[PDB]
């Protein structure tokens, strides 16, 4: 049956932590998709799929957008899409982590912050998670498609301007975290996070950053990064997750957006079209049979 489509989502989850087995069992009930979802350790929020047949498949990864800054009118930094074609062998296990949006600073359910949103530290949006599609070979994870998330918007961001998409296809380059300042940089592919507000690398579990203690100790405006890798927010915006996490400003500059992450496509696979910011919310993965 080559007409089959498997659609991977957040299974209903949002924020810096990913979903449970019971959420995905609910979201995927009465479909062709069945998955195993880790409960603990670095694989906790990650969905495990079994490839049904040896064949060529389309795999399109979409990462998550970063949050809004200090004004309801701002546009978000949309997550990056990465479309590839891959040959897979029956019974391969694919591990899938669907990125979750960075926390918005606006709108707010607090009517005292909502005043600000409609017209000091803490207005910047959170970083937002990348989407990861990888596989195990010899016990070490191997990446196939990583669709970076979008950096968070600064509290006082004035222009809806964003930088061109970055795509790597070279494992020898290290997939490190982005720089953190007052705001958390984005989680990369393999690193050692130690700050509370920086996004975690995938192999650490990819939990999204806490917001900055400068914000949370005094004013209480919370903007966390998203599953997986989303950097925490301050006045500055947080960096988005990727193979390499997007950078956050070195100071708490309120005009400085977090950078998007760097995406990744295995060179053994075939890229279909350049990477492109399209996603306005959470991420997504789509898998179909390919006609050749």
């Amino acid at each position: 049956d080559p007409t089959v489509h498997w659609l991977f989502t957040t299974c209903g989850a949002s924020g810096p932590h990913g979903p449970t087995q019971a959420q995905c069992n609910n979201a995927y009930q009465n479909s062709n998709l069945s998955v195993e979802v880790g409960s603990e350790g670095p694989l906790k929020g990650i969905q495990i799929w079994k490839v049904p047949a040896t064949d060529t498949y389309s795999i399109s990864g979409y990462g998550a957008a970063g949050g809004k800054g200090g004004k309801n009118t701002m546009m978000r930094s949309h997550g990056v899409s990465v479309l590839g074609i891959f040959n897979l062998e029956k019974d391969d296990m694919l591990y899938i982590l669907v990125g979750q949006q960075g926390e918005d600073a606006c709108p707010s359910t607090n009517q005292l912050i909502q005043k600000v949103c409609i017209g000091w530290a803490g207005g910047g949006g959170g970083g937002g998670g990348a989407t990861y599609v990888f596989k195990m070979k010899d016990g070490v994870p191997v990446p196939l498609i990583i669709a970076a998330g979008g950096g968070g918007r600064a509290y006082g961001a004035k222009t809806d301007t964003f930088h061109p998409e970055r795509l790597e296809n070279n494992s020898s380059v290290l997939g490190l975290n982005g720089n953190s300042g007052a705001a958390g940089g984005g989680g990369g592919w393999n690193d050692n996070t130690s700050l509370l507000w920086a996004g975690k690398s995938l192999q650490e579990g990819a939990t999204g950053g806490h917001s900055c203690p400068q914000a949370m100790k005094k004013w209480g405006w919370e903007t966390r990064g998203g599953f997986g890798g989303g950097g925490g927010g301050c006045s500055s915006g947080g960096g988005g997750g990727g193979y390499i996490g997007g950078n956050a400003a070195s100071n708490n500059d309120p005009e400085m957006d977090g950078e998007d992450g760097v995406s990744f496509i295995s060179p053994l696979g075939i890229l279909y079209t350049p990477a492109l910011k399209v996603m306005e919310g959470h991420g997504e993965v789509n898998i179909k049979h390919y006609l050749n």
């Epitope: 100790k217 005094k218 209480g220």
Partner: antibody, heavy 120, light 112 residues
Framework: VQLQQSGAELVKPGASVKISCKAS????????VNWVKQRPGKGLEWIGQ????????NYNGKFKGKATLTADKSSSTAYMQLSSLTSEDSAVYFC??????????????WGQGTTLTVSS | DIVLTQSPASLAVSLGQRATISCRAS??????????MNWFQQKPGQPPKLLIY???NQGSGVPARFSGSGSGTDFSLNIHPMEEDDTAMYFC?????????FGGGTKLEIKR
């Protein structure tokens, strides 16, 4: 969002207790945890607070060295240890989370309370 | 300390009637354009529950009959119309300056 406290304690004068407050459903390291004492026929008393992220503390001078506040990030648990107990320490003790300036720096989520009784 | 003088200590009210509780502070509790006066309800055997934060703002799921007023050193909690389920202790509270302090409380009881 839940704070869940440990059970009651009945102890002799001179002893110590350590009351636990286990947090869930939010980022333990980003909010202040407050402690409050309530006795019959009295109001509420603020004992102090702790910020688990970096161990910062603020005390009510009336309770310094009587209450000792700590936080354990591994378990997301806030403790209060009461030393050199007397009959004036017999009370119900609450832990409570507070939010920042935008929320009036006020409490928004309370443990169920812990009853201490001190008698010889 | 910032001392809160809550009045009255006891108050009896018929169903439907207006109940007014006052809290006066020894110094202004305004800072950054916010008033750090807050109001709480506590029934027997329960922890306290937030009614009003920053002097004027409804807490989540707090019915409309509760409302807070004031700024600086004078503040007020109004309940109207009074319902049976409002009998409880009521406390004011400031967070402007350490140490955080409570008013002395008001016990709200039914009149007969």
């Amino acid at each position: 969002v839940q704070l869940q406290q440990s059970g009651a304690e009945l102890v002799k004068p001179g002893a110590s207790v350590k009351i636990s407050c286990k947090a869930s459903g939010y980022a333990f390291s980003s909010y202040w945890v407050n402690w409050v004492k309530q006795r019959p026929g009295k109001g509420l008393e603020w004992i102090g607070q702790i910020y688990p992220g970096d161990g910062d503390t603020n005390y009510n001078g009336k309770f310094k060295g009587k209450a000792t506040l700590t936080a354990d990030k591994s378990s997301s648990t806030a403790y209060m240890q009461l030393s050199s107990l007397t009959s004036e320490d017999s009370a119900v003790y609450f832990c409570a989370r507070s939010r920042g300036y935008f929320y009036g720096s006020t409490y928004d989520s309370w443990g169920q309370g812990t009853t201490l009784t001190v008698s010889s | 300390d910032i001392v809160l003088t809550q009045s009255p200590a006891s108050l009896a009210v018929s169903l439907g009637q207006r109940a007014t509780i006052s809290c006066r502070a020894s110094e202004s509790v305004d800072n950054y354009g916010i008033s750090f006066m807050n109001w709480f309800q506590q029934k027997p055997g329960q922890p306290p529950k937030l009614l009003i934060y920053a002097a004027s703002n409804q807490g989540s799921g707090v019915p409309a009959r509760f409302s807070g007023s004031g700024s600086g050193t004078d503040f007020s909690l109004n309940i109207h119309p009074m319902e049976e389920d409002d009998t409880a202790m009521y406390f004011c509270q400031q967070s402007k300056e350490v140490p955080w302090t409570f008013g002395g409380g008001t016990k709200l009881e039914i009149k007969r």
